[PDB]
Amino acid sequence: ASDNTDAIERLKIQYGTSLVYPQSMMTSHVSVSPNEQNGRITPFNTRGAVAMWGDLGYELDLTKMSDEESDQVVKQVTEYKKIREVTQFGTLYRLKASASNQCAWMMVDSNKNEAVVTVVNVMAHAQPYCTKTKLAGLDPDKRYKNLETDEVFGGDELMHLGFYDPIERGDFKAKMYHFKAIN
Amino acid sequence: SMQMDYVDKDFEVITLPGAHANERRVQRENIGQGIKVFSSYRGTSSHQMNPFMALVDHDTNEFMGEAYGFALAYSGNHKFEVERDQFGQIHVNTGINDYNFKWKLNPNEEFQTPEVLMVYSDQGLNKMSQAFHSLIHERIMRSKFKDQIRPVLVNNWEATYFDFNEDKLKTIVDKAKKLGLEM
Amino acid sequence: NLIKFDDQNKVFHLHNKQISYLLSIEDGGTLSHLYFGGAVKNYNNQLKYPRLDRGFSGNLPESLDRTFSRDSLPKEYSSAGEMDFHTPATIVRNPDGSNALFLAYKSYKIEDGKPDLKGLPHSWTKEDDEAQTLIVTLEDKVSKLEYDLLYTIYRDRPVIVRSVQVHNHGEEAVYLEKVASMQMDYVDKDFEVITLPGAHANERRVQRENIGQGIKVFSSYRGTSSHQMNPFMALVDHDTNEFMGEAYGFALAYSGNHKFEVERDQFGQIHVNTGINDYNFKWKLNPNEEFQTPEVLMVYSDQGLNKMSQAFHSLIHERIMRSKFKDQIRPVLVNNWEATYFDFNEDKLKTIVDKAKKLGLEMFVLDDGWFGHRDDDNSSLGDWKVYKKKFPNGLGHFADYVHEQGLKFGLWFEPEMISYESNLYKEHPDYLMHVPGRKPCPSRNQYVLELGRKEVRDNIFEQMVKILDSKKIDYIKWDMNRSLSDIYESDLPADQQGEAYHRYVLGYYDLLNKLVTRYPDILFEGCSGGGGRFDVGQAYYTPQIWASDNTDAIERLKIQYGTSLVYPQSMMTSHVSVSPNEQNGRITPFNTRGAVAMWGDLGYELDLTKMSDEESDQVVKQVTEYKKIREVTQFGTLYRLKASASNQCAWMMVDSNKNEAVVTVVNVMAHAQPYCTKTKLAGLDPDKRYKNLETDEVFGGDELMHLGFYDPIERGDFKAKMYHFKAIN
Amino acid sequence: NLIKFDDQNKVFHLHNKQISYLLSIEDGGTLSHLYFGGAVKNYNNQLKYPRLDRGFSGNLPESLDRTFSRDSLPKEYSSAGEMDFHTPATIVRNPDGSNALFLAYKSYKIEDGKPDLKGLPHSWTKEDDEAQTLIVTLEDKVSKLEYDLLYTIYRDRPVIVRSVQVHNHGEEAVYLEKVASMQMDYVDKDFEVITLPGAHANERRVQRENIGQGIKVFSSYRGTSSHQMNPFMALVDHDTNEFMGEAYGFALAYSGNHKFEVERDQFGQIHVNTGINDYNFKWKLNPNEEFQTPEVLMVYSDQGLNKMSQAFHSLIHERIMRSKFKDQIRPVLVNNWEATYFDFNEDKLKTIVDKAKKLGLEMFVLDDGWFGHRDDDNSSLGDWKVYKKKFPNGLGHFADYVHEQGLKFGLWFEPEMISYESNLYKEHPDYLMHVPGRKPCPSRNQYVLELGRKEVRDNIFEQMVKILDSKKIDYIKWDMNRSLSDIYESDLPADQQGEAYHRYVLGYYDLLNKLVTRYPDILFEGCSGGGGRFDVGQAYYTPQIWASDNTDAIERLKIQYGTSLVYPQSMMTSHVSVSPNEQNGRITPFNTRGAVAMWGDLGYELDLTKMSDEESDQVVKQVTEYKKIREVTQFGTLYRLKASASNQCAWMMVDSNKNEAVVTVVNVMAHAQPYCTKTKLAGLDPDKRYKNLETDEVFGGDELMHLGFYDPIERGDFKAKMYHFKAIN
Ligand SMILES: [Pt+2]
Ligand SMILES: [Pt+2]
Ligand SMILES: [Pt+2]
Ligand SMILES: [Pt+2]
Ligand SMILES: [Pt+2]
Ligand SMILES: [Pt+2]
Ligand SMILES: [Pt+2]
Ligand SMILES: [Pt+2]
Ligand SMILES: [Pt+2]
Ligand SMILES: [Pt+2]
Ligand SMILES: [Pt+2]
Ligand SMILES: [Pt+2]
Ligand SMILES: [Pt+2]
Ligand SMILES: [Pt+2]
Ligand SMILES: [Pt+2]
Numbered sequence A: 001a002s003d004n005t006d007a008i009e010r011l012k013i014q015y016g017t018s019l020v021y022p023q024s025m026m027t028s029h030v031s032v033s034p035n036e037q038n039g040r041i042t043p044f045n046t047r048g049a050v051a052m053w054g055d056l057g058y059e060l061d062l063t064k065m066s067d068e069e070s071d072q073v074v075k076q077v078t079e080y081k082k083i084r085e086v087t088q089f090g091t092l093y094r095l096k097a098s099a100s101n102q103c104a105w106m107m108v109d110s111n112k113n114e115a116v117v118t119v120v121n122v123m124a125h126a127q128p129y130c131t132k133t134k135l136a137g138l139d140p141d142k143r144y145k146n147l148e149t150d151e152v153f154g155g156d157e158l159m160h161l162g163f164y165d166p167i168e169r170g171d172f173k174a175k176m177y178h179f180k181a182i183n
Numbered sequence B: 001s002m003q004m005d006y007v008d009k010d011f012e013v014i015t016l017p018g019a020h021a022n023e024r025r026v027q028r029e030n031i032g033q034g035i036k037v038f039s040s041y042r043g044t045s046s047h048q049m050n051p052f053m054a055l056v057d058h059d060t061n062e063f064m065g066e067a068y069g070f071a072l073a074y075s076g077n078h079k080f081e082v083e084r085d086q087f088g089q090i091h092v093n094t095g096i097n098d099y100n101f102k103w104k105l106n107p108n109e110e111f112q113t114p115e116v117l118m119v120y121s122d123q124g125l126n127k128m129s130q131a132f133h134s135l136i137h138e139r140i141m142r143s144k145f146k147d148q149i150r151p152v153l154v155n156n157w158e159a160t161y162f163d164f165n166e167d168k169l170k171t172i173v174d175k176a177k178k179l180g181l182e183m
Numbered sequence C, D: 001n002l003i004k005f006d007d008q009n010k011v012f013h014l015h016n017k018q019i020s021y022l023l024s025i026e027d028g029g030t031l032s033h034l035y036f037g038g039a040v041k042n043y044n045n046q047l048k049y050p051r052l053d054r055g056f057s058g059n060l061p062e063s064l065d066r067t068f069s070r071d072s073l074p075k076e077y078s079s080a081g082e083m084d085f086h087t088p089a090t091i092v093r094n095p096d097g098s099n100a101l102f103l104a105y106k107s108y109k110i111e112d113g114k115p116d117l118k119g120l121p122h123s124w125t126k127e128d129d130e131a132q133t134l135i136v137t138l139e140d141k142v143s144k145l146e147y148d149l150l151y152t153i154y155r156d157r158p159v160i161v162r163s164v165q166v167h168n169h170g171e172e173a174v175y176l177e178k179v180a181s182m183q184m185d186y187v188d189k190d191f192e193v194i195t196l197p198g199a200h201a202n203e204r205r206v207q208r209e210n211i212g213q214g215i216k217v218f219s220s221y222r223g224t225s226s227h228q229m230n231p232f233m234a235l236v237d238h239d240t241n242e243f244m245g246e247a248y249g250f251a252l253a254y255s256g257n258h259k260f261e262v263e264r265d266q267f268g269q270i271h272v273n274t275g276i277n278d279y280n281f282k283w284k285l286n287p288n289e290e291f292q293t294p295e296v297l298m299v300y301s302d303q304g305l306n307k308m309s310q311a312f313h314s315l316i317h318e319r320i321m322r323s324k325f326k327d328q329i330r331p332v333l334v335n336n337w338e339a340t341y342f343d344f345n346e347d348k349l350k351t352i353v354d355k356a357k358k359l360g361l362e363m364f365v366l367d368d369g370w371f372g373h374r375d376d377d378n379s380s381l382g383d384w385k386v387y388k389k390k391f392p393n394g395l396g397h398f399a400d401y402v403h404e405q406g407l408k409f410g411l412w413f414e415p416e417m418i419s420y421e422s423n424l425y426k427e428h429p430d431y432l433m434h435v436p437g438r439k440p441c442p443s444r445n446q447y448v449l450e451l452g453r454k455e456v457r458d459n460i461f462e463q464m465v466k467i468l469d470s471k472k473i474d475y476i477k478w479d480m481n482r483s484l485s486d487i488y489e490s491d492l493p494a495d496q497q498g499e500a501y502h503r504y505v506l507g508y509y510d511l512l513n514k515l516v517t518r519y520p521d522i523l524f525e526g527c528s529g530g531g532g533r534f535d536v537g538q539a540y541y542t543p544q545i546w547a548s549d550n551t552d553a554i555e556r557l558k559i560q561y562g563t564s565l566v567y568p569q570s571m572m573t574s575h576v577s578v579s580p581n582e583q584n585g586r587i588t589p590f591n592t593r594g595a596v597a598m599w600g601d602l603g604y605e606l607d608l609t610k611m612s613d614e615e616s617d618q619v620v621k622q623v624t625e626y627k628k629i630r631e632v633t634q635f636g637t638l639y640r641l642k643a644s645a646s647n648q649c650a651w652m653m654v655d656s657n658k659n660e661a662v663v664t665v666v667n668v669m670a671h672a673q674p675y676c677t678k679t680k681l682a683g684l685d686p687d688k689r690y691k692n693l694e695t696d697e698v699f700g701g702d703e704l705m706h707l708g709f710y711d712p713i714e715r716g717d718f719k720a721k722m723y724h725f726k727a728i729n
């Protein structure tokens, strides 16, 4: 998609790219920090999450990685392998554009049984406004389990009430959600 | 490849300008009397202006409102022209850029233009993008891999640049295997 | 099953197939607002407000938990003295001189239907099964006050209705310096705000603003809902228009002083209050007494302003207006005001009546100047006896004549007012509202009556009964031509003078309710130098209102456009008037004055007498074609199509079965090199086929809505065209 | 001779070389606003308000002329009860219970200089000849109240200062329910309005809005001027910016509840009130008493916001600030708060003192935690005696140590506050502001003192004097860490509880004035959880104020930018803090934190003893360089060049001779593919030649202002660059 592999600048690039092109058609790699192209310092988790929008790769010297990072990779990859059928090939919905201070998107499988959501916060403030993220592409009448929390919400809930984004300190943070329809 | 003329439409136009390491930011403008030109002379479709354009209502967003999408199926010089004329009418051409273009058509020969994909959405940009995504993925892409999960790969470029040889790479291969990478 | 309480999570849920309203009981019994919008089947705590220690946002009494604060929480209500620094919903003055009130959740009840509001207009139910009302009770354990918060939801409307009732259960009196009808707090919403400001002869333009940090106030201190700012407000998404997007409408059912407050705070939250203006408001609530606020109508739309408006139209018309005339077609009338002013007599009237009958007009309204010695606006208000010089044989004689010609008869009154030069002021000087010892300010050289007092109200009521009891008046135009400036009620203790504004309105409601109740077969039309009192509370009594003294076709476009944002079109009257316009001097085609006056209930305000046979015929042609469409134009679903600012204003009405549509398209300025424009319709059935009754061509509803049709190119300014579509078989 | 009265047309004209302010006496002795802006030599009645009969705009008592109306006239002031429906400058409550007031011109005086305001901060003069005050008196003949409106114009400033004094010349008491310091009415002006909203750790972002019909309110109920809305407002043309276009600035010299009201009315006119907030304000004015309002500083700029800000900066610094330190270079100090919080004792501090000396710092300020038994923020407020366990040899021992190391010594107090866990509360529980019978609301787990009571103030004053009389304390940081929530003054009668808010501010000002006058050699730095009380009033007492608890380099950019809108940079303090930043987690270059902190009065707030050699020498460098430029940075004419939304924030200072300029440019976000940017300068002499002291290259003032220079392209977020130019010969 771009020689620019900064997590943050990639947000707008991948966002615009998604305007026309399916996400399976763009590739995104977790690169080093500070970023080689612009010098930005970003969380490893953020680089991962942004790079899971496209086809995930790694472009950095795996042998010069810290144990902390080696296992970060092992985690990212292992989790990506669980969700990539939905992230790579699901109906894509853009939720928030980076100018809002958040960029958020999500993928839903063809049956509306599975959805993967990502929310990225750009700038932090000493005194943050509360934000909600609302979803799209779900079935109003199905019931979805947050696989992390085990709590369950109707598709109508997730589309109308949405949920509070967790308030975190620090620039460039990401959070990811995986919902699955139950019986 | 096509021309389209609207009467009594107050559109804004969305394109995807950018640069190297800075591709495809969404841009959205008013359409004034005169000709707005989005194009490339670079012999490629280019970093600086993607061969795509959308016409939307002033109130259209990601979830609501009408949008016309135009995508040129061509990887060389393109020219998108958007003209509001003396009578308020909006006139749109798209095709191979005419800059240093002059094709000798001899008797009994033919000339085929690239085609342009036109998409109409009645409910926002997401829906529009989604029809491009579907058409591209299902009726344009011919790769046998198009419906296959893409491998989680490691590319050595930002890792070692030219500074590498075989043994250096093998060690990266070994770290890759341990991390769960596929390519 | 419209309203549920979850005693486990302490969440109240009002919902039907359209809307959901969610509120909860937070820490320290604080009533929190969770959500209002599209319906959801369930709630699972996801909107629980985030806990964060926010600098200078203080905490519950005795609490050690700094992460929870009534200054940051989104709430259903608020008061002074609770550690909250938004503009509070309610402010109470205690005997010790403090303004402290701390309301905590006490209990709730869920009832069928909705309770009546004493002394006040309100929406209602026909069948109890059609609505439920949640009443949450908050209390202050110390002063022992109890606030009842009412929430009504109808089964089939996207409407929540709110009001407040305050109860003093203590040993001593307390003063209410402010009690809002509702508060609503939003989180993470970026809204624009729509209001309808104006002036006399210039009512209710649509204004749309961004909301910045601070407090935006829209209000009236005039003692009336007013020409300057209608008691309406909507919060909308930046992208919302007539046809798409979120919109929240708020309509206060009150005719006095209102205050809408929209506040974005330090945390980007949006705080909204609405109720009686607290300007010079101070209600003495004695032990064991109660205070009921006017109610507010809340509409949620998920598809643009037209839909919002229509829900308001339907509610007002079906569940508020009580007039037996509300479902009945309104007479094409002629009013002698602009036509002759005070210049008239029983025999010149008869000539107007005669011309009216010939033009097919259905009613004749007699305007100002028939009573007292009313030869101009400098005397006689308060003397509601026939002016014999002008009706030698008495008014009943003249009314009989009108009825002979086959026309209904209408009469103008201004019962709230009094002139220095009147028999009333000579007999009862103290009936005139002033501050004892201060010369009151005149307005149109008249003054206001102390309607707060029963004896004043009784006097007017009996004068009017003397006129009306023989049932020769079929119609009353109740006018009101000045604001209140000298605020006092002479029979009240000094410490109750803060009750004068609200008492005036209550007294106005009492008197008006009496007359309307006593003469149910009289068509009441409200008036206040135009639409100076055009509100939902007025609808309850009078089914139609004179929209504006401005009768210019072109300026009525935005006045009527704006009015239709809240009020059904059958509630606004519009009259074909003379050109050049009396108010602004504009020159307009007679057909255009017609077309614009057919949006409201058609009438005429021009000297039928001095009229050529040549244009008399245009009037016959207008009246005739109006009788053809008026069932649809008056009561069909209304869709605004284009606003004046576009250089075109367009609107249409569609009947309930979507078989008939009437469309009007008015062009404002002509251009030497004009752009082609198209008009597309709305509210049709995609699968029906409609015949244009003028050309006989037939089009599908899908065609009429997607494709539209070209507006004909015409030379000249201020031009109109009408369309009539009927579904075929 | 700056003030003239033309007794022919009844017009007052205040003028100098820069500005004219015209007001007139209109029909019914109505004080009318004509004009404020660029100076004009004469006036010839060309702004007499047009007469027109406007519907529902009533007229003067006893008047027959309907074309004149206090409801449409642009005025210098207004009250409830005069047939005006704008929001009134003043509302009075009379014994009869009414809110009637009808002010009419009575008399005027002209004095040299300007009067001191009793109990209040205010602008003043050194020489009488530098100002004239016009005082116009208006009277209600019935209530016998007299309103004095003061207007002061300085000979050499684009400023008018207004305030009000109310006199009760009657027999009975009256209540002032609202009294604004000024009202200003514009005709045919399309303004936008700029204010400085914010929150704790997020003060004073610039905000700029359209003005719609209705009332926009910027205010505070917190008992302080507040974090959330600074008491300042500016009206500008749509096209006005930092360098061009007209701007009206309004700054209220008051540190309590303020209310700024901005109303566009039904006739397009813009109506502005400013003064003490009227929320729970009700002042009992007995016979023969007077009431003085704070004054408001009005500035007119014909050429952009910088020029406007510059006139505020000059006036505040030269004719408001009284500190003997106001013209003295401020010390480069280290404050231990973010360094150690409460976790410290004497020896820990001494080591910080030692590191300070080595780094070139000039002052050590001991922050919260040194007193009572203050181990955290849950106790001890009110106990202003040293905490033995931490300073076993007393506080003077430690102060002696700081002085022996060559540093000045500073000390933190929070004189207004009390904890439940204190000896003060155990000995005088009634000193705690609350409404008797109600548990008061905690904030940061503390409560407010009843500062309206002399005996309360005396107690704190005597406590602090014990400590300060040693003269070992060279500097005081006066903090104040919560808003007022429970409004009561236990010594006032019930009917006087509406005086609590304002009395508190009077008490505050009185206590502060006492201390500041008694210790003229102590540098006082104001603070209120950061910039929670950052106003022109405060400036009169404390020559510098801690701008914000937010010490992130990046967020401080917008905070300091907005602050600079009104306040001189020497009046705000900025400290280099740790990274990641304690308040928001942002990671910033050390150099960037320095550069941003050199905009205000430079300090350090981080554990100097835990610094890396790399950083120790960074500090040594910063301090050494700051000491070279601080005369220009602290006291030069300030010019803002770029606002952070551009992705750069840039500013600069120029000395009074235009011989020396210090410029700073900060880039927020980095991009892989950067656009080239130029920075152009301001405030230089076009004809002088300036040397870049870093590069030794020389450029004309014209060059630097017109060509500017390229900003260097750097990778990485949050970078700063600094320039120092000096005129050569
Ligand atoms: Pt993830
Ligand atoms: Pt930000
Ligand atoms: Pt949805
Ligand atoms: Pt939905
Ligand atoms: Pt839904
Ligand atoms: Pt839609
Ligand atoms: Pt739409
Ligand atoms: Pt929905
Ligand atoms: Pt929408
Ligand atoms: Pt035009
Ligand atoms: Pt339709
Ligand atoms: Pt349709
Ligand atoms: Pt359709
Ligand atoms: Pt017609
Ligand atoms: Pt000038």
Ligand SMILES: [Pt+2]
Binding pocket: D244, D245, D303
């Ligand atoms: Pt200029």
Ligand SMILES: [Pt+2]
Binding pocket: D244, D245, D246
């Ligand atoms: Pt200008």
Ligand SMILES: [Pt+2]
Binding pocket: D594, D595, D598, D722
């Ligand atoms: Pt520097």
Ligand SMILES: [Pt+2]
Binding pocket: D669, D671
């Ligand atoms: Pt950027």
Ligand SMILES: [Pt+2]
Binding pocket: A122, A123, D668, D669
């Ligand atoms: Pt940023």
Ligand SMILES: [Pt+2]
Binding pocket: D681, D682, D683, D684, D705
């Ligand atoms: Pt310059």
Ligand SMILES: [Pt+2]
Binding pocket: D686, D702, D705, D706
């Ligand atoms: Pt210059």
Ligand SMILES: [Pt+2]
Binding pocket: D686, D702
């Ligand atoms: Pt120049």
